[PDB]
Each structure stands twice: as structure tokens, then as C-alpha cells.
Amino acid sequence: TPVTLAKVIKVLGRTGSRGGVTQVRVEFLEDTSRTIVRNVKGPVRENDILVLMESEREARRLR
């Protein structure tokens, strides 16, 4: 299946995430208005692109 590319518009704070896991909000590059909340393992900042294998799942707190 094709993969989706989504740009990080904001690194969410005070999430309660597990250490090393960062919760972010990303806006789709294909449709530039749709947004989704995701979990990121690496060091992430704003305005970098994530490659999402699935575009439909909404992320939850990992704890």
C-alpha cells in the first residue's frame, strides 16, 4: 500500500506519555487540511515529515 506523508505542526505537551515517546499533531501533505494525532519514537520537532504506514488510527496515550 502507498504510505502517507504528514508534516508535524505541533509537538503536544503535558500529554503524560511514556519516556522516549512524544505525542504530536500532524497535518497531511496530500490533503493539506486534515490532521491526526500520532506517537513518535525519535527526536521530533515542528515542520518535519513523518511517513505513516496507516493514516486512519488515532493515537492514544501509551503510559
Partner: peptide, 23 residues
């Protein structure tokens, strides 16, 4: 326990489900 905001989402789920079912 839950963070603030997660309680808001679960309350929104429950309440909006009840409201939509009643309507």
C-alpha cells in the same frame, strides 16, 4: 490515573453518545 483532557474526551464520548441516541 488519567490526565486532564483524557477525562474530557471520555466525558464527550459518553455524553454525546447519549445525546445523539436520545435525539
Amino acid at each position: 490515573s488519567l490526565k486532564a483532557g483524557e477525562r474530557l474526551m471520555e466525558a464527550l464520548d459518553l455524553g454525546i453518545a447519549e445525546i445523539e441516541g436520545l435525539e
